mmCIF file of all heavy atoms in Angstrom:
data_model
loop_
_atom_site.group_PDB
_atom_site.id
_atom_site.type_symbol
_atom_site.label_atom_id
_atom_site.label_comp_id
_atom_site.label_asym_id
_atom_site.label_seq_id
_atom_site.Cartn_x
_atom_site.Cartn_y
_atom_site.Cartn_z
ATOM 1 N N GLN Y 76 30.704 30.521 94.628
ATOM 2 C CA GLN Y 76 32.053 30.648 94.544
ATOM 3 C C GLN Y 76 32.813 29.575 95.203
ATOM 4 O O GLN Y 76 32.583 29.415 96.484
ATOM 5 C CB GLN Y 76 32.471 32.003 95.041
ATOM 6 C CG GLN Y 76 34.000 32.233 95.003
ATOM 7 C CD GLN Y 76 34.613 32.065 96.345
ATOM 8 O OE1 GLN Y 76 34.036 31.930 97.320
ATOM 9 N NE2 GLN Y 76 36.037 32.129 96.336
ATOM 10 N N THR Y 77 33.589 28.770 94.560
ATOM 11 C CA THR Y 77 34.238 27.707 95.077
ATOM 12 C C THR Y 77 35.837 27.906 95.059
ATOM 13 O O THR Y 77 36.373 28.497 94.137
ATOM 14 C CB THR Y 77 34.042 26.384 94.270
ATOM 15 O OG1 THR Y 77 34.605 26.476 92.974
ATOM 16 C CG2 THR Y 77 32.564 26.238 94.146
ATOM 17 N N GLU Y 78 36.446 27.389 96.207
ATOM 18 C CA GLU Y 78 37.922 27.483 96.255
ATOM 19 C C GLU Y 78 38.498 26.147 96.096
ATOM 20 O O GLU Y 78 37.832 25.130 96.078
ATOM 21 C CB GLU Y 78 38.196 27.987 97.780
ATOM 22 C CG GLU Y 78 38.065 29.441 97.910
ATOM 23 C CD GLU Y 78 38.489 29.941 99.321
ATOM 24 O OE1 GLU Y 78 38.783 29.070 100.215
ATOM 25 O OE2 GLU Y 78 38.521 31.105 99.579
ATOM 26 N N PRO Y 79 39.859 26.017 95.866
ATOM 27 C CA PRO Y 79 40.478 24.709 95.713
ATOM 28 C C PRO Y 79 40.386 23.826 96.960
ATOM 29 O O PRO Y 79 40.658 22.645 96.852
ATOM 30 C CB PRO Y 79 41.929 25.064 95.354
ATOM 31 C CG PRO Y 79 41.837 26.297 94.669
ATOM 32 C CD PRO Y 79 40.736 27.117 95.401
ATOM 33 N N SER Y 80 40.181 24.467 98.121
ATOM 34 C CA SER Y 80 40.131 23.643 99.337
ATOM 35 C C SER Y 80 38.828 22.802 99.404
ATOM 36 O O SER Y 80 38.837 21.751 100.028
ATOM 37 C CB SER Y 80 40.158 24.503 100.571
ATOM 38 O OG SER Y 80 39.042 25.376 100.614
ATOM 39 N N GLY Y 81 37.792 23.227 98.705
ATOM 40 C CA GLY Y 81 36.508 22.565 98.657
ATOM 41 C C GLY Y 81 35.397 23.348 99.170
ATOM 42 O O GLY Y 81 34.265 22.952 99.054
ATOM 43 N N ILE Y 82 35.772 24.468 99.907
ATOM 44 C CA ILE Y 82 34.659 25.272 100.490
ATOM 45 C C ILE Y 82 33.912 26.077 99.438
ATOM 46 O O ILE Y 82 34.431 26.328 98.308
ATOM 47 C CB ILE Y 82 35.293 26.231 101.540
ATOM 48 C CG1 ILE Y 82 34.283 26.764 102.530
ATOM 49 C CG2 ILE Y 82 36.186 27.314 100.947
ATOM 50 C CD1 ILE Y 82 33.377 25.821 103.270
ATOM 51 N N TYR Y 83 32.664 26.403 99.719
ATOM 52 C CA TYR Y 83 31.813 27.098 98.709
ATOM 53 C C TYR Y 83 30.739 27.792 99.527
ATOM 54 O O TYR Y 83 30.244 27.324 100.521
ATOM 55 C CB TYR Y 83 31.258 26.166 97.730
ATOM 56 C CG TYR Y 83 30.132 25.226 98.270
ATOM 57 C CD1 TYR Y 83 28.811 25.473 98.096
ATOM 58 C CD2 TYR Y 83 30.515 24.097 99.051
ATOM 59 C CE1 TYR Y 83 27.850 24.619 98.553
ATOM 60 C CE2 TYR Y 83 29.569 23.292 99.562
ATOM 61 C CZ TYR Y 83 28.237 23.500 99.342
ATOM 62 O OH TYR Y 83 27.322 22.699 99.919
ATOM 63 N N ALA Y 84 30.352 29.012 98.982
ATOM 64 C CA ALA Y 84 29.349 29.816 99.616
ATOM 65 C C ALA Y 84 28.764 30.694 98.619
ATOM 66 O O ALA Y 84 29.499 31.195 97.682
ATOM 67 C CB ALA Y 84 29.857 30.591 100.803
ATOM 68 N N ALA Y 85 27.492 31.058 98.778
ATOM 69 C CA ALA Y 85 26.905 32.018 97.874
ATOM 70 C C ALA Y 85 27.385 33.444 98.100
ATOM 71 O O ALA Y 85 27.885 33.661 99.151
ATOM 72 C CB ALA Y 85 25.368 31.962 97.897
ATOM 73 N N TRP Y 86 27.110 34.348 97.134
ATOM 74 C CA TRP Y 86 27.515 35.716 97.326
ATOM 75 C C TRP Y 86 26.656 36.630 96.628
ATOM 76 O O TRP Y 86 25.914 36.212 95.734
ATOM 77 C CB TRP Y 86 28.945 35.982 96.900
ATOM 78 C CG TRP Y 86 29.997 35.272 97.588
ATOM 79 C CD1 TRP Y 86 30.645 34.095 97.199
ATOM 80 C CD2 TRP Y 86 30.686 35.698 98.792
ATOM 81 N NE1 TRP Y 86 31.588 33.723 98.144
ATOM 82 C CE2 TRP Y 86 31.611 34.747 99.077
ATOM 83 C CE3 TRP Y 86 30.584 36.837 99.568
ATOM 84 C CZ2 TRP Y 86 32.484 34.747 100.180
ATOM 85 C CZ3 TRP Y 86 31.414 36.891 100.691
ATOM 86 C CH2 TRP Y 86 32.379 35.877 101.019
ATOM 87 N N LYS Y 87 26.649 37.920 96.955
ATOM 88 C CA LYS Y 87 25.999 38.935 96.264
ATOM 89 C C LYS Y 87 26.900 39.626 95.353
ATOM 90 O O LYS Y 87 26.377 40.444 94.479
ATOM 91 C CB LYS Y 87 25.383 39.955 97.286
ATOM 92 C CG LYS Y 87 24.394 39.351 98.255
ATOM 93 C CD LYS Y 87 24.099 40.298 99.348
ATOM 94 C CE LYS Y 87 22.828 39.981 100.127
ATOM 95 N NZ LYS Y 87 22.694 40.795 101.351
ATOM 96 N N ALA Y 88 28.174 39.452 95.427
ATOM 97 C CA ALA Y 88 29.266 39.903 94.706
ATOM 98 C C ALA Y 88 30.526 39.251 95.124
ATOM 99 O O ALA Y 88 30.607 39.009 96.374
ATOM 100 C CB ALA Y 88 29.459 41.490 94.873
ATOM 101 N N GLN Y 89 31.438 38.906 94.276
ATOM 102 C CA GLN Y 89 32.624 38.201 94.739
ATOM 103 C C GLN Y 89 33.669 38.353 93.648
ATOM 104 O O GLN Y 89 33.354 38.743 92.494
ATOM 105 C CB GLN Y 89 32.327 36.678 95.044
ATOM 106 C CG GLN Y 89 33.373 35.959 95.854
ATOM 107 C CD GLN Y 89 34.101 36.872 96.779
ATOM 108 O OE1 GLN Y 89 35.187 37.297 96.528
ATOM 109 N NE2 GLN Y 89 33.395 37.129 97.890
ATOM 110 N N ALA Y 90 34.930 38.160 94.075
ATOM 111 C CA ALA Y 90 36.031 38.383 93.074
ATOM 112 C C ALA Y 90 37.114 37.379 93.545
ATOM 113 O O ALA Y 90 37.454 37.172 94.726
ATOM 114 C CB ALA Y 90 36.468 39.822 93.106
ATOM 115 N N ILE Y 91 37.828 36.872 92.538
ATOM 116 C CA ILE Y 91 39.000 35.951 92.757
ATOM 117 C C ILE Y 91 40.023 36.194 91.703
ATOM 118 O O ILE Y 91 39.693 36.751 90.681
ATOM 119 C CB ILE Y 91 38.480 34.476 92.681
ATOM 120 C CG1 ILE Y 91 37.556 34.312 91.537
ATOM 121 C CG2 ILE Y 91 37.857 34.033 94.008
ATOM 122 C CD1 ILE Y 91 37.073 32.891 91.309
ATOM 123 N N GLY Y 92 41.257 35.863 92.104
ATOM 124 C CA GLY Y 92 42.381 36.081 91.221
ATOM 125 C C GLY Y 92 43.522 36.863 91.802
ATOM 126 O O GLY Y 92 43.709 36.867 93.047
ATOM 127 N N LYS Y 93 44.216 37.566 90.907
ATOM 128 C CA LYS Y 93 45.434 38.379 91.452
ATOM 129 C C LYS Y 93 44.849 39.615 92.210
ATOM 130 O O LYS Y 93 44.146 40.397 91.619
ATOM 131 C CB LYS Y 93 46.286 38.758 90.232
ATOM 132 C CG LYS Y 93 47.457 39.697 90.640
ATOM 133 C CD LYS Y 93 48.348 39.937 89.426
ATOM 134 C CE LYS Y 93 49.536 40.819 89.775
ATOM 135 N NZ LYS Y 93 50.562 40.070 90.637
ATOM 136 N N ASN Y 94 45.332 39.690 93.389
ATOM 137 C CA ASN Y 94 44.974 40.754 94.332
ATOM 138 C C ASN Y 94 43.449 40.912 94.413
ATOM 139 O O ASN Y 94 42.855 42.012 94.176
ATOM 140 C CB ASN Y 94 45.599 42.081 93.865
ATOM 141 C CG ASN Y 94 45.516 43.252 94.969
ATOM 142 O OD1 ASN Y 94 44.797 43.072 95.940
ATOM 143 N ND2 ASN Y 94 46.263 44.278 94.680
ATOM 144 N N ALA Y 95 42.751 39.810 94.816
ATOM 145 C CA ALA Y 95 41.348 39.842 94.858
ATOM 146 C C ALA Y 95 40.876 40.543 96.175
ATOM 147 O O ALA Y 95 39.675 40.864 96.234
ATOM 148 C CB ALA Y 95 40.772 38.416 94.897
ATOM 149 N N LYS Y 96 41.704 40.763 97.114
ATOM 150 C CA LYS Y 96 41.276 41.401 98.370
ATOM 151 C C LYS Y 96 40.970 42.846 98.133
ATOM 152 O O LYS Y 96 39.972 43.421 98.549
ATOM 153 C CB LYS Y 96 42.313 41.258 99.455
ATOM 154 C CG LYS Y 96 41.951 41.851 100.790
ATOM 155 C CD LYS Y 96 43.085 41.880 101.728
ATOM 156 C CE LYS Y 96 42.681 42.426 103.112
ATOM 157 N NZ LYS Y 96 42.590 43.865 103.035
ATOM 158 N N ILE Y 97 41.827 43.645 97.391
ATOM 159 C CA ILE Y 97 41.631 45.056 97.160
ATOM 160 C C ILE Y 97 40.408 45.268 96.214
ATOM 161 O O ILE Y 97 39.814 46.369 96.332
ATOM 162 C CB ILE Y 97 42.843 45.721 96.643
ATOM 163 C CG1 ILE Y 97 42.966 47.117 97.149
ATOM 164 C CG2 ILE Y 97 42.973 45.726 95.147
ATOM 165 C CD1 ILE Y 97 43.099 47.299 98.616
ATOM 166 N N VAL Y 98 40.049 44.332 95.407
ATOM 167 C CA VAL Y 98 38.882 44.484 94.572
ATOM 168 C C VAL Y 98 37.584 44.073 95.236
ATOM 169 O O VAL Y 98 36.549 44.609 95.035
ATOM 170 C CB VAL Y 98 39.063 43.887 93.214
ATOM 171 C CG1 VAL Y 98 39.136 42.362 93.312
ATOM 172 C CG2 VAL Y 98 38.004 44.380 92.164
ATOM 173 N N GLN Y 99 37.662 43.161 96.135
ATOM 174 C CA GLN Y 99 36.459 42.687 96.874
ATOM 175 C C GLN Y 99 36.164 43.732 98.010
ATOM 176 O O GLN Y 99 34.984 43.846 98.350
ATOM 177 C CB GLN Y 99 36.673 41.300 97.553
ATOM 178 C CG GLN Y 99 35.419 40.543 97.946
ATOM 179 C CD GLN Y 99 35.286 40.397 99.406
ATOM 180 O OE1 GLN Y 99 36.349 40.273 100.084
ATOM 181 N NE2 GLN Y 99 34.150 40.475 99.929
ATOM 182 N N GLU Y 100 37.178 44.389 98.539
ATOM 183 C CA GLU Y 100 36.964 45.376 99.493
ATOM 184 C C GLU Y 100 36.245 46.554 98.934
ATOM 185 O O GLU Y 100 35.357 47.148 99.678
ATOM 186 C CB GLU Y 100 38.301 45.810 100.151
ATOM 187 C CG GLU Y 100 38.156 46.606 101.451
ATOM 188 C CD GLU Y 100 37.059 46.085 102.310
ATOM 189 O OE1 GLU Y 100 37.182 44.925 102.770
ATOM 190 O OE2 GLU Y 100 36.009 46.747 102.489
ATOM 191 N N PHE Y 101 36.580 47.032 97.764
ATOM 192 C CA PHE Y 101 35.903 48.129 97.091
ATOM 193 C C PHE Y 101 34.464 47.774 96.847
ATOM 194 O O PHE Y 101 33.575 48.587 97.008
ATOM 195 C CB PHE Y 101 36.636 48.505 95.828
ATOM 196 C CG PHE Y 101 35.789 49.268 94.871
ATOM 197 C CD1 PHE Y 101 35.477 50.648 95.124
ATOM 198 C CD2 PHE Y 101 35.281 48.737 93.688
ATOM 199 C CE1 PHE Y 101 34.675 51.362 94.222
ATOM 200 C CE2 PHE Y 101 34.520 49.449 92.820
ATOM 201 C CZ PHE Y 101 34.251 50.736 93.112
ATOM 202 N N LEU Y 102 34.220 46.596 96.442
ATOM 203 C CA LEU Y 102 32.877 46.091 96.128
ATOM 204 C C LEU Y 102 32.054 45.923 97.362
ATOM 205 O O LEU Y 102 30.826 45.942 97.284
ATOM 206 C CB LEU Y 102 32.989 44.783 95.373
ATOM 207 C CG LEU Y 102 31.946 44.450 94.337
ATOM 208 C CD1 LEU Y 102 31.735 45.600 93.460
ATOM 209 C CD2 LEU Y 102 32.420 43.264 93.630
#
């Protein structure tokens, strides 16, 4: 998962977009 800042890291589940915090928290 890459961000526009340039940072990147692997994940076991991830979510991005509109209100990605509430969906990543449930996951």
Side-chain angles (χ1 to χ4, degrees):
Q76 180 254 355
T77 69
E78 278 186 358
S80 66
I82 195 57
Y83 69 104
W86 296 94
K87 298 170 166 169
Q89 197 30 260
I91 42 177
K93 178 176 179 70
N94 192 351
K96 183 186 181 284
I97 213 65
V98 67
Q99 197 247 328
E100 193 41 65
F101 160 73
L102 214 47

